[PDB]
């Protein structure tokens, strides 16, 4: 085991537990797959 | 005046001296421009009045430019890793140097040599 703090294996999604398709904008570290439904609860309204 | 035959095809009379000396060798025109500047040939005049003394000057300039002030980074064939050091070797025997590198790659027979033998790209052309 060589756990490194860089690259694809550095991190993993908090909710979906899969690091694939993770968006790192604003250091949210949440997967977009769950973000699709978490967008309203997160409080981040869709307007246009 | 026009059409002055040299070691290579140098029919460049009406066109300018810089392009004239690019056509024979160093067609990337940067080495040609710097060696023309070193030989101190005014590019304003055209290539229809090239003199044998200026031709001698340019060939002597290109003959071992390491003794001159052209930097090694600009000078092609910087290392060609071996026990010694080489230089840019213009035209026919430059092609000889390149094919010697190719044959050494063949006898070394690595992956890029195998791709050269098969006639394929080095990085990969992605023909899928």
């Amino acid at each position: 085991v060589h756990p490194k703090k860089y690259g694809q294996g550095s991190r993993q999604c908090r909710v979906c537990s899969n690091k694939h398709a993770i968006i790192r904008k604003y250091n949210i570290n949440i997967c977009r797959q769950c973000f699709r439904e978490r967008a309203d609860i997160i409080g981040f309204k869709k307007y246009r | 005046q026009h059409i002055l035959r040299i070691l290579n095809t140098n029919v460049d009379g009406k066109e300018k001296v810089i392009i004239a000396l690019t056509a024979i060798k160093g067609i990337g025109k940067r080495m040609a421009t710097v060696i023309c500047k070193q030989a101190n040939v005014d590019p304003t005049k055209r290539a229809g009045e090239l003199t044998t003394e200026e031709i001698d000057n340019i060939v002597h300039i290109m003959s071992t430019p390491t003794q001159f002030k052209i930097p090694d980074w600009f000078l092609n064939r910087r290392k060609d890793l071996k026990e010694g050091k080489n230089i840019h070797v213009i035209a026919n025997q430059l092609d000889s140097y390149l094919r010697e590198d190719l044959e050494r790659m063949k006898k070394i027979r690595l992956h890029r040599g195998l791709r050269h033998h098969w006639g394929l790209r080095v990085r990969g052309q992605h023909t899928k």
Binding site: K25, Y26, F35, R36, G43, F44, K46, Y47, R48 | -
Partner: protein, 98 residues
Amino acid sequence: IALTSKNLRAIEKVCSDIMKGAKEKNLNVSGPVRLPVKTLRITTRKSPCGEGTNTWDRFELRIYKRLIDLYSQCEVVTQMTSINIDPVVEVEVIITDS
């Protein structure tokens, strides 16, 4: 004293409370400060599976920050803010002299 939030009505009502308190207390209070609003834009795409016409949505979050200044004791203004504030609004305190 500066405040930050998301919803505009909350910051408007507490700013109105701020100016009312300043007028009542008669302090060396600076004029209202109206910083430009910041929009935070993110892009997303629908259709979790790649099938279908790939379509995208734009999500914007609007910040709201304002500033003021007062010349008074910090304890009274912080107690007023505490009694007349919303837990969803964040406030920093900076004082002025003259």
